[PDB]
């Protein structure tokens, strides 16, 4: 199956004293593997998965140097953006940046991403070709001109098609015991009566990895979306994921309804019945 490496960066300004709160996290697929938190004592990029602890002190020195540089870029950006948008020094503002690479089942480059938001709104993003920019407004268009003149897209494309995919492959190999293992959903159904004529069936998927999954209901073999509720996939906290989908049915007609589960860890989709 496909894989990805992504880095997420958030800076939140602190009006009145000092630099922004900066938090960086890195993921391989749905697995967090590194973090940096400016409020933490170490001031180092820190490991969050056992397989990254294989990397030597040179790796940690490098990631720490680079992530501190990212924090300084965001500090400057918060000031620049306050100027572009004619905002006061009174309020807290947020910058978010995400970038990374997707590879296919053959671990070859599929797509790269580099996008930026100010106060939760799209600001500027690299297009799919990795050669030009989508700027949402005139402030971002000023950034686009600056980044065009400085050949930023070229630098990012080299990183995304090169370093990003090379280190993703390295991590996939080093962390193979977990990163290349799929955990199929563990499924069951629960039943509740709300009244003498209405029941709820809830189809559960637990303990799965990666997070991507599809859960659907059928009635007499036909897709059923009405009277259903599908919750957001949620982290268990042990590295796996959970999800459920429910349907409301006439009491006594439970037999008509079937839940269908698709996941990379299941060779064939699975069916459950009450």
């Amino acid at each position: 199956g496909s894989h990805s490496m992504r880095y997420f960066f958030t800076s939140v300004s602190r009006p009145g004293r000092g630099e922004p709160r900066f938090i960086a996290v890195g993921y391989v697929d749905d697995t967090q593997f590194v973090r940096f938190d400016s409020d933490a004592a170490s001031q180092r990029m820190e490991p969050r998965a056992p397989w990254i602890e294989q990397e030597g002190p040179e790796y940690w020195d490098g990631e720490t140097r680079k992530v501190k540089a990212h924090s300084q870029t965001h500090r400057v950006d918060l000031g620049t953006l306050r100027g572009y948008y004619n905002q006061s020094e009174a309020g807290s503002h947020t910058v978010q940046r995400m970038y990374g690479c997707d590879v296919g089942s053959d671990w070859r480059f599929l797509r790269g991403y580099h996008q930026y938001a100010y106060d939760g709104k799209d600001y500027i993003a690299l297009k799919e070709d990795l050669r030009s920019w989508t700027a949402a407004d005139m402030a971002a268009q000023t950034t686009k001109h600056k980044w065009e003149a400085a050949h930023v897209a070229e630098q990012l494309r080299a990183y995304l098609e090169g370093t990003c995919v090379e280190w993703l492959r390295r991590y996939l190999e080093n962390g193979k015991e977990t990163l290349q293992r799929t955990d199929a959903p563990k499924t069951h159904m629960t039943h509740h009566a709300v009244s003498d004529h209405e029941a709820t069936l809830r189809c559960w998927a637990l303990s799965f990895y990666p997070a991507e999954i599809t859960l659907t209901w059928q009635r007499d073999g036909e897709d059923q979306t009405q009277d259903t509720e599908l919750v957001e996939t949620r982290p268990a906290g042990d590295g796996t994921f959970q999800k459920w989908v429910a349907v409301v049915v006439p009491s006594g007609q439970e037999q008509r309804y079937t839940c269908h589960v698709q996941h990379e860890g299941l060779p064939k989709p699975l069916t459950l019945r009450w």
């Binding site: 490098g62 680079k66 870029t73 950006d77 620049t80 953006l81 930026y116 930023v152 370093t163």
Partner: peptide, 9 residues
């Protein structure tokens, strides 16, 4: 492995 430059807006 993170990018070695971070570009200001």
């Amino acid at each position: 492995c993170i990018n070695g430059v971070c570009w200001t807006v």
